[PDB]
């Protein structure tokens, strides 16, 4: 139900499995060998992306799950200028 996302800089992020399956690359990582079927950790080790971009993509996962289809009230995603151009490559890697 809950999967674990570990950044390169030691940081650990835990989000719901349905929330983290909206990105194709994490879905591929969870599938295949090493599923680690404890139904609680499913921990994936991201050896490249830093901690802040992983926090932002987890926030994006929750944001997209909440607003996958709603009314016109869709609030904008608060992307800082410093976190851009590093979240773009992160979304390219994750196929978000």
């Amino acid at each position: 139900m809950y999967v674990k996302l570990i950044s390169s800089d030691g940081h650990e992020f835990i989000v719901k499995r349905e929330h983290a399956l909206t990105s194709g690359t994490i879905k591929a990582m969870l599938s295949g060998p090493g599923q680690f079927a404890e139904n609680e950790t499913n921990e994936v080790n991201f050896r490249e992306i830093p901690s802040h971009v992983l926090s932002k993509v987890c926030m994006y996962f929750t944001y997209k799950v909440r607003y996958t289809n709603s009314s016109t009230e869709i609030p904008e995603f608060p992307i800082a200028p410093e976190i851009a151009l590093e979240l773009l490559m992160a979304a390219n890697f994750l196929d978000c």
Binding site: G24, T25, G34, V44, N92, F93
Partner: protein, 143 residues
């Protein structure tokens, strides 16, 4: 240490990736940390700078798949006593390996292959058909 296009040596990363995909195709136990590291290596090789090693990676994967399918072909051809049992076991293993490898090669399929060539799982299935059951068509059908 970052998602930056960098000058990466093809030999070492391809050797590591070849070992991991051999373990995956043979359905042997592979560490999932190494599996995520091979996603990282796939991403690094797909958009490496200044040489976008996507054609090289695709050709090397095709060569490895051809070699693996030919080795299984030789084994199942010399095991004519239970060619069907061996073919069933090897088909289960190769189908699971092809699915898991298409999972591993998702970035290559979505960023170089389609956007023509064939997908890595599709290429694995095509190589299995063209070098595993096409030469063994007569024996498999008749037995």
């Amino acid at each position: 240490t970052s998602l930056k296009p960098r000058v990466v040596d093809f030999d070492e990363t391809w050797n590591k990736l070849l070992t991991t995909i051999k373990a995956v195709v043979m359905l042997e136990y592979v560490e999932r940390a190494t599996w995520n590291d091979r996603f990282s290596d796939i991403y690094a090789l797909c958009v490496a700078y200044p040489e976008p090693l996507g054609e090289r990676l695709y050709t090397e994967t095709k060569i490895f798949l051809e070699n693996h399918v030919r080795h299984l072909h030789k084994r199942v051809l010399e095991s004519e006593e239970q060619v069907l049992v061996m073919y069933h076991r090897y088909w289960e293993e190769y189908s699971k390996g092809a699915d898991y490898m298409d999972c591993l090669y998702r970035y290559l399929n979505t960023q170089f292959i389609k956007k023509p060539l064939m997908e890595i799982g599709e290429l694995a299935l095509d190589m299995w058909r063209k070098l595993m059951v096409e030469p063994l068509q007569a024996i498999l059908i008749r037995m």
